Structure 1
Amino acid sequence: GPGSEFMKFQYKEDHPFEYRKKEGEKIRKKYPDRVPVIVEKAPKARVPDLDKRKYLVPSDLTVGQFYFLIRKRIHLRPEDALFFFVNNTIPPTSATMGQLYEDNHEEDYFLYVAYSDESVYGK
């Protein structure tokens, strides 16, 4: 398969590009102050999977606020590590989700966020 640092989302493996782009473009035209986000565990992560992986988040929510919400859903221990990756790098927690989206969304108009217990995506 691919190299360990190539970001793979089961969402993309389960839904053809056409379906994703139709959905992402429609949701952005409808809700211009919200951004659509797919959240999944990185393949090698020793972290629980998320119940819900598809989010519509306010554009003025910060990355650190979204992280709080996602971490709350995973039900981690107080000592546990968790890192987000967008396009292979840890996104700045002080950025807004709207800015992160504007810079990083794919051609299907989704923003893709992976999480791991390791600070490097493929480790």
Structure 2
Amino acid sequence: MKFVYKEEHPFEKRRSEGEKIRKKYPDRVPVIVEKAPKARIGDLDKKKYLVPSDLTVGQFYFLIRKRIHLRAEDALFFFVNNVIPPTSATMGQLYQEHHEEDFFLYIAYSDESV
């Protein structure tokens, strides 16, 4: 999957901004959230998040769930580098293992678990 955000900003601008955000908010991680290519699910109004590193992935699911106005019966899946991240992880842990070289963590969401 390609992210619109990577398609709109040259790599060097991304890395420069990511580097600065990590220095300026060391208790947080910068995260880009976009809908997966062929997913049938609501749109997400905002895609750039400055997330406390101690927030769990589970809590972030809930937060994103709310922004999309998903009902509880509705499914939501995160994908990071083709892996579904564990809900028990903190966003800081997820960020450490999966952030890209522009210092951003990219998360795709979908109604499908594949």
* Shorter-chain TM band: over 0.9
Structure 2: gaps (5+ residues): none
Tell me if 1:57 matches 2:51.
yes
Equivalent-residue separation in structure 2 for 1:71 and 1:33 (angstroms):
23
Q: Cα RMSD between the aligned structures?
A: 0.7
Task: List 4+ stretches of structure 1 deviating above 4 A.
Answer: none
Aligned-residue offset at 1:48: 1.5
Secondary structure at the counterpart of residue 36 of structure 1: strand
Aligned counterparts of 2:80 and 2:106: Cα–Cα separation in 1: 6
| Alpha-carbon shift at residue 78 of structure 1 (Å) | 2.6
Per-residue CA deviations over 1:55-104 (Å, capped at 9, x if unaligned) read 00000000000110000100012321110001111100000000000000
Find the counterpart in structure 2 of residue 98 from structure 1.
Answer: 92
> Which residue identity lines up with residue 59 of structure 2 in the other structure?
Q
TM-score normalised according to structure 2 size: 0.97
Distance 2:95 2:23 in 1: 14
Structure 2 residue 26 is the aligned partner of structure 1 residue 32? yes
1:19 aligns with 2:37: no
- Matched residues, number: 114
Q: Distance in 1 between matches of 2:44 and 2:91?
A: 19
Q: Which runs of 5+ in 1 are unaligned?
A: 1-6
Structure 1-normalised TM-score?
A: 0.90
